[PDB]
Amino acid sequence: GPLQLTPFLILLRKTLEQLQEKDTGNIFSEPVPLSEVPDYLDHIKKPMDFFTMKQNLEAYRYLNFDDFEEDFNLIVSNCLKYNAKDTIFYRAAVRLREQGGAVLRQARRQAEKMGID
């Protein structure tokens, strides 16, 4: 496929893989299937998942670090909104939020040190 090489997209690639590594169950790897979860959009305005984040990255739809981060935060916040607290999914989203926070803090520092956050 096409492949764009800029320092910012290089950083987003690394950061994204670092985030996905924290989702040990691959719970967030793909869109929630609306065909199996027909009430999902009743609750969720903008679904997000890591496959979609990767495609956004590669298309140059993230132009700054904030916008990338906002989509990671959606993954988490959507999951916490839709699923009940006692579910494995909710609990997975809490773990992801806390581990991903550290990843994003480090990466943002790098984006700022380069002229690119």
Partner: peptide
Amino acid sequence: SGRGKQGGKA
């Protein structure tokens, strides 16, 4: 929350 995704029981 909504109806729930299968396979979520802890």
